[PDB]
RNA sequence: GAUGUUAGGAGGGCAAAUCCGCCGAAUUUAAGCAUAUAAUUAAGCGGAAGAAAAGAAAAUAACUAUGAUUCCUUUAGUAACGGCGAGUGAACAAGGACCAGCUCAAACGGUUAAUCCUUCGUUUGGUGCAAACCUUUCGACGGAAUUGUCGUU
RNA sequence: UUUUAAUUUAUUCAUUGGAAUUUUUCAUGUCGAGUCGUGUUCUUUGAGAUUGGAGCACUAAUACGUGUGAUACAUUUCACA
RNA sequence: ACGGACCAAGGAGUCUAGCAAAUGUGCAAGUGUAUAUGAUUCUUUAAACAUUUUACGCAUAAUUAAUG
């Protein structure tokens, strides 16, 4: 090495020329996926190919505030919109047995998105015009005319779309109701030091508690 | 840190129960094998040794029977778990 | 870019350009940092001091997301909001702006800079600076923790 | 020996991409340039030109 | 309910009734030849507990594999190399005795058939001895079961060969998820392939 | 158990770019060289598919929490490893592509193995000129299986 | 020409079986053993009083368990599986 | 002192990764739209075009072995 620059550390020493690849086909297959879930779609027949995630928050407390799209509604939530899982997968709607709803607000921001799917469903007959009632929850099946008349509107993706989310930064209160005397680094600093006593207090309360 | 099921958290960052303010919530075919299985197999001749040490009965002896048990299973929690499961056994036995 | 190139202007001295005693031999001292201490101390010296040695504790696994957290000073709480609201917040002295820069993706807040005299500003941050808070109780605000 | 992995694409703002096209559409709606770039024009009306 | 006493008496191994049996299985199974079928499995509640099952097409082999490592396999006793990988004795091979020994008899022995699974049967001083579960992929007893026949399509040849028994998960870290792995989920080698791979796009 | 010039079947070999196991160096770098690096690579042995392998948590997190696997952007040349020298070097979260989840082990049918396979003949209708092929079930016989198949989750 | 979305046609007769959705009780059941784990040796890893694997010795508990929560240890909480 | 008997043709500071400096360009406390996504773009088209109202990279704050 000479004059003034940055030390090298280029991880670059072994047989890397085998490793290298480059992606000149790129937009060929963006092509090839969109035509690929254009047929998808254009096949199974009108059925949008999408299928209804739980908007759930983000974890760790980095993300903390965002929400984004889950793998699945949980028991309790599809309970709540009367619908067995073993059943609501069939109507397009996502499932897991591993989230747990560890909070009211959790379960009643899926349980109406759950009902607002519910209210577009339009089931199909089966057997060559005999429309029936449905089972396990699934809303009802619709006839000849109606069919022919619903089959051909314009489809809805923005509730399959994530949940577009507004909250409100800009936002103010009256000057006279604010608390004057509060001290939050002062609050901070308190808390950081009283740590551990609230968790000796809290062990000694469920040691207490396992009685 | 440590939360709590109940008492709700608090709006604070930092300390007990940060965060978010959200809402929370919430063998008779056995002992008939294990009576059985005792009864075709006994003990393993480490149980043995185990039992005669606890038998003879002293401090010393409970702290050399914890540590055979110790070093004939590895670690720790083992240990104390097969000499009060002997120390039981053979309380029961005394009848 | 082959024509830019300083070899083009050369193609027939000989030496290319490397010296004609001293020649371009291939590595002539060392590969990579090899001469750490030894012969490349005196370069390692005068542009890099600090870097053989090690100091402090092992933090085992990291987890950036626990510690992460952006920062914002207090002369730039005025700029969020657009000044048309900024207007009509400094006007009326019956009411003042409420931010939480947590929205804005802001955790701590410090006191660096000036805020605006006699215009109270309730602010709504994960963590806050002492000086920061001064500022704001001074300026006649008021610090609203959040998490 | 020449090897597939050449810089052969590059990567240009978007930015610079459509301040470049509006400086285009500006110079095409000027008679010197367009005269100057080759276009035989010298019996049209009107350099922007446009048509129903 | 009889399998489940079955269990527990083969959970003790120390009894003097286990000693006994084992002792006098182990010394049968010296005797009989290395690779041998078994007309009946002699562990029915481990068997079943695996993949094994009592249809026409499944069959049972025991097999005796030698314990110990197996030494490095340098002429004389000498490598030309470095003093890193001069050694020669304390060679550990990767591979278990338990996956060793179906692949000796899922190899050319029994060849038409595939490996489900293998277990312990018994032990010895410079032995160690197993069971191993075959399946006959074109016997149609199975073939026709809409269970187990997965193993009939030709994707599961030589799984023993290729790591995909029990034993060969096991020894490929395929037995441990999280952090304790990490690098061995997409296998081994295609994870320090991926990660040593390097992507340049095309307009950089 | 042995045996079948018993009936019906399979394995062998070729081919490797991608893929799955095993075994496994040294040149090189450290301006020497021994740990280290090259490299969990080259060579060697074995094994499949159109993809393979991984895959449904004995996971991550510590949060307002997430929810199989794989791959892409990033984490990040970071945490860390290392004559702490040369050099080596992840994982979580995040944004996306794709997105399907499932069954064996015990309970019970013992007022009925409720199961499975082989062989031999009949028919339920069909697309092909034909050859063949898709469907058809009355069975009967021979067995396997209670040292446990199926039904039941 | 292959299929795949929409689209000609259902009517009855019949008992035969099965399934799936929702109320009253039991029973809180089962849950993978020379396996996990530990010690030691070798190898591997960024994994460091050991990341995984393998060889040898010892060798478990039964869900109130044991397994993780990146520093060895004892006592003990919590979270997840 | 070494190479050169002659002539023709070929013949050697390049490519990629990463950093800095210099200069030009655009925007500016912001900047780059990454993977991807849609579009009656779809010899030319593997490029151009666009991003239903906080992804990340670098910068905007430093310092400490570290609670901070």
């Not at chain 3, 929205?103 to 920061?132: C, D, E, M, T």
């Not at chain 5, 890193?84 to 692949?103: D, F, I, P, Y």
């Not at chain 5, 058939?113 to 399946?135: C, F, H, M, P, T």
């Not at chain 5, 999280?178 to 950089?204: D, E, T």
Request: glycine letters at 8%; aromatic letters at 8%.
């Amino acid at each position: 090495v000479a004059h003034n620059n940055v030390l090298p550390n280029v991880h670059l020493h072994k047989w890397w020329q085998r490793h290298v690849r480059v992606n000149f086909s790129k937009n060929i297959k963006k092509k090839k996926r969109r035509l690929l879930r254009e047929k998808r779609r254009k096949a199974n027949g009108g059925t949008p190919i999408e299928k209804l995630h739980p908007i759930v928050h983000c974890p760790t407390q980095r993300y903390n505030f965002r929400t984004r799209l889950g793998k699945g509604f949980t028991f309790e939530e599809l309970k709540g919109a009367g619908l067995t899982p073993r059943a609501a997968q069939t109507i397009g709607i996502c499932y897991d047995k591993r989230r747990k709803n560890r909070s009211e607000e959790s379960l009643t921001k899926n349980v109406e998105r759950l009902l607002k799917y519910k209210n577009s469903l339009v089931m199909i007959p089966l057997k060559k015009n005999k429309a029936k009632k449905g089972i396990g929850g699934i809303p009802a099946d619709a006839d000849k005319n109606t069919i022919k008349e619903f089959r051909n509107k314009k489809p809805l993706l923005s509730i399959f779309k994530k949940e577009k989310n507004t909250k409100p930064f800009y936002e103010t209160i009256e000057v006279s109701k604010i608390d004057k005397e509060f001290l939050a680094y002062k609050t901070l600093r308190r808390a950081k030091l009283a740590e551990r006593r609230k968790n000796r207090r809290q062990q000694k309360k469920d040691i207490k508690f396992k009685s | 840190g440590r939360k709590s099921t109940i008492k709700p958290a608090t709006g604070i960052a930092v300390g007990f129960n940060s965060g978010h303010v959200v809402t929370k919530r919430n063998s008779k075919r056995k002992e008939l094998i294990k009576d059985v299985v005792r009864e075709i197999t006994g003990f393993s001749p480490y149980e043995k040794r185990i039992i005669e040490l606890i038998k003879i009965g002293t401090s010393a002896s409970t702290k050399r029977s914890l540590k055979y048990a110790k070093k004939k299973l590895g670690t720790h929690k083992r240990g104390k778990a097969k000499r009060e499961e002997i120390q039981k056994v053979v309380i029961l036995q005394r009848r | 870019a082959t024509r830019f190139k300083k070899n083009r202007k050369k193609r027939g001295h000989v030496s290319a350009g490397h010296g004609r005693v001293g020649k371009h031999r291939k590595h002539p001292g060392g590969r990579g940092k090899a001469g750490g201490l030894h012969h490349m101390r005196i370069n390692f010296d005068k542009y890099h001091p600090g870097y053989f040695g090690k100091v402090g504790m092992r933090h085992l696994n990291l987890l950036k997301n626990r510690t992460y957290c952006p920062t914002i000073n207090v002369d730039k709480l005025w700029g969020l909001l657009p000044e048309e609201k900024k207007k009509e917040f400094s006007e009326n002295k019956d009411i003042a702006p409420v931010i939480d820069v947590t929205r804005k993706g802001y955790f701590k807040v410090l006191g660096n800079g000036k805020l605006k005299h006699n215009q109270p500003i309730v602010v709504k941050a994960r963590y806050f600076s002492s000086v920061a808070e001064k500022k704001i109780k001074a300026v006649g605000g008021q610090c609203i923790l959040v998490a | 020996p020449t090897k597939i992995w050449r810089r052969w694409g590059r990567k240009v703002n978007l930015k610079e991409k459509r301040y470049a096209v509006c400086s285009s559409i500006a110079a095409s709606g000027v008679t010197s340039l367009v005269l100057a770039r080759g276009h035989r024009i010298s019996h049209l009306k009107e350099v922007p030109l446009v048509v129903s | 309910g009889a399998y489940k006493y079955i269990q527990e008496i083969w959970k003790k191994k120390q009894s003097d009734a286990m000693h006994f049996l084992l002792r006098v299985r182990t010394w049968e199974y010296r005797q009989l030849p290395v690779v041998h079928r078994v007309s009946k499995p002699s562990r029915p509640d481990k068997a079943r507990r695996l993949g094994y099952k009592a249809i026409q097409g499944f069959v049972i082999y025991r097999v005796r594999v030698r314990r110990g490592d197996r030494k490095k396999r340098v002429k004389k006793g000498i490598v030309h190399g470095k003093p890193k990988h001069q050694g020669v004795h304390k060679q550990k091979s990767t591979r278990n005795l338990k996956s060793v020994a179906e692949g000796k008899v899922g190899k050319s022995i029994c060849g038409n058939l595939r490996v489900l699974n293998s277990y312990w049967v018994g032990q010895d001083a410079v032995y160690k001895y197993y069971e191993v579960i075959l399946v006959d992929p074109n016997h149609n007893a199975v073939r026709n079961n809409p269970k187990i026949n997965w193993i009939c399509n030709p994707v599961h040849k030589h799984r023993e060969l290729r790591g995909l028994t029990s034993a060969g998960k096991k020894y490929r870290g395929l037995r441990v998820k999280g952090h304790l792995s990490a690098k061995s989920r997409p296998s081994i080698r295609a994870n320090w392939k991926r990660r040593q791979l390097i992507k340049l796009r095309k307009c950089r």
